[PDB]
Curated annotation (Swiss-Prot), chain A:
Active site per UniProt: A84 (proton acceptor)
Protein name as it appears in the record: Gamma-glutamylcyclotransferase
Job description of the protein: Catalyzes the formation of 5-oxoproline from gamma-glutamyl dipeptides and may play a significant role in glutathione homeostasis. Induces release of cytochrome c from mitochondria with resultant induction of apoptosis.
Record organism: Homo sapiens
Annotated PANTHER family: GAMMA-GLUTAMYLCYCLOTRANSFERASE
Gene Ontology CC terms: cytosol; extracellular exosome
An example molecular function term from Gene Ontology annotations: protein homodimerization activity
Stated induction or repression of this protein's expression: By geranylgeraniol.
Keywords on record: Lyase, Phosphoprotein
Pfam families named in the record: AIG2_2
CDD domains from the UniProt entry: GGCT_like
Summary of subunit composition and partner proteins: Homodimer.
Amino acid sequence: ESFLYFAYGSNLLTERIHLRNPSAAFFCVARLQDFKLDFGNSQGKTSQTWHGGIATIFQSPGDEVWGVVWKMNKSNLNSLDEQAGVKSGMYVVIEVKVATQEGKEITCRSYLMTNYESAPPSPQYKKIICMGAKENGLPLEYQEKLKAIEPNDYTGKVSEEIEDIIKKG
Amino acid sequence: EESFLYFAYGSNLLTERIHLRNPSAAFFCVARLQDFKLDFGNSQGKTSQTWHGGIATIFQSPGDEVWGVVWKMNKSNLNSLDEQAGVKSGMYVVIEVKVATQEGKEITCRSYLMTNYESAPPSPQYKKIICMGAKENGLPLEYQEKLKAIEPNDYTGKVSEEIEDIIKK
């Protein structure tokens, strides 16, 4: 009746995931070996929520991606796929094996883009990701990596819920 | 439940091929994957030394379709099948897809695609295996025409005795 979800993007932040998934429960922090983080425009299309490149991952030996594993009820599978834009070709559903800091291997559902053009994230998107990583105690080494991501030059506004989250941050 | 369904779109379209490492695989049905495009390539820039040409992959592309065979397999074969796809070497990633049978029924299947590759044409031998499986397993004749239309590379050397034998007959 449950599944595990590996979040590496804006769903790193508790308040963000709980927006559409209030019953999501923190499971653990984990590392996905031999994948690299990237930001981009699915189908060449710019996120009208984020106004910049959005998070994705691809296989790349020697690289790693840290994220948060969330536990979720199986009844939320369709909703979570909807959120990720599966039917509209935005992300594909994946299965990955991630490692906890104690070396336990965890099988999780996640998402990645299959057809995108690489593009820098907006300041607000980067900030939510930065806040999530910090909140959930991802390695300091990884946190600084996220801090050093070059954002695009968007100086406009995102949704009030998101903007309010950053203000409280 | 004991079993899972696996969607094959490459060399595992051929019964004799999939049976060589997965002898207990059973034909379930033919199905269509909507809004995906078939491609061939060198995963992580490496050319397959089994096939000596680009190997099969898929990516999200509105408008396009990929037809394939759904195989029913015991859940004890999961790790083996992941092993065959080179998941651990970063060749393919495990995906979940929803496919439609010719009668319009949606099926949830395990499959694979490449996340980091260079586009390169298949070897004549690879194309033959795929064409054979497509034909043997009753994929629509228009899709068979698409497959027959694939431009192969120029490889005319030796592939394994097991593969050459299958094509021969």
